[PDB]
Amino acid sequence: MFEARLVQGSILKKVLEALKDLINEACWDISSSGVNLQSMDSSHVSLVQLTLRSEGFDTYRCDRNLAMGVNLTSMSKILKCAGNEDIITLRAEDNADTLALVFEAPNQEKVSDYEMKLMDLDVEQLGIPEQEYSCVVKMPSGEFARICRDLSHIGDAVVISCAKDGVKFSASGELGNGNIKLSQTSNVEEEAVTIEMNEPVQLTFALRYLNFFTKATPLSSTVTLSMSADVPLVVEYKIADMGHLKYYLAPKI
């Protein structure tokens, strides 16, 4: 039997608003370590990887490992019924066809119990080994969001050029071209643009996808991008104290 109690319900609310649109169906692996999710969107151009560590839950228990096929669209509807100050408990039975979500309103005067039906999925998960990228940019998630949304008006793709003192995003379209340059900041913390570069990189990506990742903006003050030539970009939102949420986006060419 699995039962996890997250006093900060809002977290789990945010996680799902950040996934539902990119992935509609996904497998929720449950274990003693915590809850993990890996899933590719329909086109297979992007991949998401969620990790909510057991240490982040007030109460976490897992007698046996579970792989719950879930409809993220439905789980989003259900989580929309939770208040941002609600204590969220998740409980599932081993031989079960359902996941139980219980929301406790602060004063103990309101309690909600939802029973979401699970589903069968023919999932395909990838083997992504730990790497050391050429460039790693830590920057404000609000800033990344802004940049992505804006350049979307100018073009479809964005050319991210990373160098020692700064990272530049560029877009091209019929109306002309846009070019945003962020300079590495000294002594500011969430307002900083710090870079870790082993060697300059310049990659092209589809903006429509990046504007889905930015839906995980409320999860963290910062967002870190890791790049290397000819390999998928990694935009990661650290779900403070829980774990993280990573989005990989295959490059163009």
Partner: peptide, 18 residues
């Protein structure tokens, strides 16, 4: 040309029965 994630990493398929 848009590449797909599967062009870079090894894939293994899983059948979830819930």
């Amino acid at each position: 040309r848009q590449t797909s994630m599967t062009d870079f990493y090894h894939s293994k398929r899983r059948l979830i029965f819930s």
